[PDB]
Amino acid sequence: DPLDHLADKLFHSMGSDGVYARTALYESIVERLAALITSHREAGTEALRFPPVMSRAQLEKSGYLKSFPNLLGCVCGLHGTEREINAAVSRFDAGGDWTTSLSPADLVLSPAACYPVYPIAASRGPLPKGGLRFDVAADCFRREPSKHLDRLQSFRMREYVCIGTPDDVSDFRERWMVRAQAIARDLGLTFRVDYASDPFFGRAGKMLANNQRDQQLKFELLIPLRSEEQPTACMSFNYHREHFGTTWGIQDANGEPAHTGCVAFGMDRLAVAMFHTHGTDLSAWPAKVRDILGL
Amino acid sequence: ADPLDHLADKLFHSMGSDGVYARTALYESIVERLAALITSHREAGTEALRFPPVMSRAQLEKSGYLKSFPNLLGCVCGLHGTEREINAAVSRFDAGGDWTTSLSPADLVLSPAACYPVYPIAASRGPLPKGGLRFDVAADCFRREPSKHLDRLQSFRMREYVCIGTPDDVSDFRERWMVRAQAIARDLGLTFRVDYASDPFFGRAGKMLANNQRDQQLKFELLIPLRSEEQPTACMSFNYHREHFGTTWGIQDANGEPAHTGCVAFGMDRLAVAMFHTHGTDLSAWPAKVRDILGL
Amino acid sequence: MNATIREILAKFGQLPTPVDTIADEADLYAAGLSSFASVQLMLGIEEAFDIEFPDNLLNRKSFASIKAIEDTVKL
Amino acid sequence: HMNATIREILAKFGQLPTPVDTIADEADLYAAGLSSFASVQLMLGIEEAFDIEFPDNLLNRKSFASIKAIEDTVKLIL
Ligand SMILES: Nc1nc2c(ncn2[C@@H]2O[C@H](COP(=O)(O)O)[C@@H](O)[C@H]2O)c(=O)[nH]1
Ligand SMILES: Nc1ncnc2c1ncn2[C@@H]1O[C@H](COP(=O)(O)O)[C@@H](O)[C@H]1O
Ligand SMILES: [Cl-]
């Protein structure tokens, strides 16, 4: 794979595909990319930072099981008494399987950064005129082991989220489709934009994906990393219509179920794209890109 | 009522789970300044690694975490079955039942401490150089201990400096950091004491481990009165592991003996909460010297 | 066939008004059919019969109205 | 006999590199090769092969420094 040669300078093995330790070089660029994205944050945006876990009940309510059940990571633990726990441990020592004693917690690993923001918005009552805008970030988890450097199980997501009327969100959407492309251009990256679909699960998932692609609810910015025919989505814009507004009882200023939309930046894909494009020697990066990043 | 509780309004939003909170811009700005302050005190020749919130279950098993803290571990499980099996689990949930009966363990756990993944990495490089190796590591860590207290989180950020080397390399490292960290705490205007302590080893077996640890002074903590002056909160720890991890991972020092290891751990969320408890939630009202130390 | 769909639409459609009110020509989405309800409706049309939609006709259009569904099945 | 029972457990759980018969009553078990985790297993063995419960005041390195220390500690309990 064309990205494989980057591993030496960017990552160390942690004994699991898609889960790597990040070198200082790599993290320095992740941090500069985050600062760049922050510099483009629109007026009136509230910033929240989420941990890598979220409430299982919230995610169930979000509909995640009807879309991507195969991708979810659930937190489980040894919940028994001292004797029960000791028994599980003893089986491990004996060469048996301690994990049969695991039981689910009330937590899952967050699959995307935006989910916790909707019940937070809903808790404040009806939206003001113009809606609400959020800047959210989380370490996210997708259960899809791969050896490719652009397909990780644990990765950082940064999103700007708009919650408001259909006009509020469509205005936000037009703006961020332009801004995301301007950011990629300033970073010296080659890309195209296309409509796409989320990887919905199963046969019902085929209909969902068709509808999403037909309705143009998902825009992706695609960067050729391993090939031009199989480019990698590094930014997306997702229009959810009234899905989350209805789910969480969010009312816009007109008393209607709110629409929501988000622009998502895959921070680790963008970092890998930068290194693939510009190499691992920062001193040689294009002057304009170094300037844009504040190097 | 908890003296900390009133901080929640400016610092956190509920995520529907005790010990798991969304962080406001105010709170994050201080966590970030604290991290930058800690970075400014980094020793020369220290390699910085950043780890994700998950690590190898096999590595964590090998490190002995199961024997010591099985009650605190978070394991990653997923729906690994066929499409039919998964669809049925989802259908049971739709019908008032439990979809989680279809979960099975993945090969990952949530990281319980930032240092664990560094030991196999160090081991993979061969014998240590003279003077040993030093690392600057960080991760979002997880411990299954739900609480409503703001100083006891389930998901929290840990920053550590780790030393791997001879017993002398490691013991001098821990002493340098114990002094340096107290000086930092004083600059931040914090009230504290440093005392011996022990990890919360599980079960009867664990009472002996805790006793020996305290007796051998393998763990110091920097303790800050948050909820009360009688039960202060450990916001940093200074840990000596003797040859435990060196032996586990087959790390050899420059003299060919099983390496010793130790670490200094900073609880970033605990420190941030301590700052807000100590100086309040209005940053312009913080002491000028503290503001200067943090580059505010 | 029409009677077979009215029971399904009442079972999985989850619209705020009874299936005996819809008029076979009216848009089901304006009627209150959501996306996730519509996929449950699709799955029900595959179960009450013994057919699997080609992903070509697996879309919003084929489930727009009750007459839209009926026509699609025969094909 | 209590001496011999203890010695068997030290073979059962001690994880010692050199056999128990080649170890004196008064002798440093830790220098001999008794690790922390092992000393706790050993302690659990001394609890299994007899039927006793160490007070957490004797739950330490000193109580298990030597066979004699173990023998004496156990005796001082019952
Ligand atoms: N490194 C990495 N980034 C991912 C992965 N899945 C999604 N992303 C990033 O996260 C963004 C949002 O994901 P989405 O919500 O569109 O599935 C993507 O556009 C991409 O940049 C993954 O498995 N690995
Ligand atoms: N449950 C927790 N919530 C928040 N911070 C924690 C928690 N547990 C540990 N820490 C912090 O992490 C540091 C290192 O943890 P330890 O490995 O227990 O010494 C501690 O000194 C605390 O500052
Ligand atoms: Cl990413």
Ligand SMILES: [Zn+2]
């Ligand atoms: Zn989103």
Ligand SMILES: [Zn+2]
């Ligand atoms: Zn550590």
